[PDB]
Design a binder for this molecule. Structure first.
Ligand SMILES: CNCc1ccc(-c2cc(Cl)cc(Cl)c2)o1
Lengths: 126, 125
């Protein structure tokens, strides 16, 4: 049946770098945007809603506001990759890619985030 | 748009009893079963799948074998209620009710489970 697949489920990213986590689903013929739902979340924090044609951000968590860009271009190729700019220590954890396009599945992807000493020191308080 | 709503988000059940946690979604007219999906899952343990008219248990987690039953009747009124039989403390935690019906949402429900001394004594060892 319908199945979202993840090129890798573990990404290890350095502090402050960019990060594109990929998520592929099948595109029958040409992608029907009105029938598509894409939904990126990370440990109960809603990162991105893509519902029947456009992005819902009025539900986006604060900690991700204007850092999480869903590549509206690669949706037409069945790749819902999420791009996060300037990664922080807080961004490490289990991400969930949930897709509903005549069927629905999800996959988990883990991010560990490396940081130099100074970053890990400021995260130890702030 | 589409909205899954949960009558309670906290259940407190005593040990060894049964428990039905409800989950409602909108029913427009007559229900389209082939397009309906019901995932009931609990902290990365899948409890119940409902795809194209039937329950899939091909991934039902060990902890739930023939104890977790989704009431197929109440689907027709948009009621995704889940029954867990003779609950153990391993069942305390946060459940996710996920529904895909021309649109999609989910909600969380937390279960705390109270138990007498001997039962806990076991979950310890
Ligand atoms: C906040 N958007 C909720 C959302 C988007 C996609 C899903 C979903 C639903 C089901 Cl029934 C199954 C699977 Cl695998 C995923 O839920």
């Amino acid at each position: 049946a319908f199945t979202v697949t993840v090129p890798k489920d573990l990404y290890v990213v350095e502090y402050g770098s960019n990060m594109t986590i990929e998520c592929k689903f099948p595109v029958e013929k040409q992608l029907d945007l009105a029938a598509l739902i894409v939904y990126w979340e990370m440990e109960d924090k809603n990162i991105i809603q893509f519902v029947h044609g456009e992005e819902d951000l009025k539900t986006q968590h604060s900690s991700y506001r204007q850092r999480a860009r869903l590549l509206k271009d690669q949706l037409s190729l069945g790749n819902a990759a999420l791009q996060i700019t300037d990664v922080k220590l807080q961004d490490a954890g289990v991400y969930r890619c949930m897709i509903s396009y005549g069927g629905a599945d999800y996959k988990r992807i883990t991010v560990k985030v490396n940081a130099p000493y100074a970053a890990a020191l400021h995260h130890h308080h702030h």
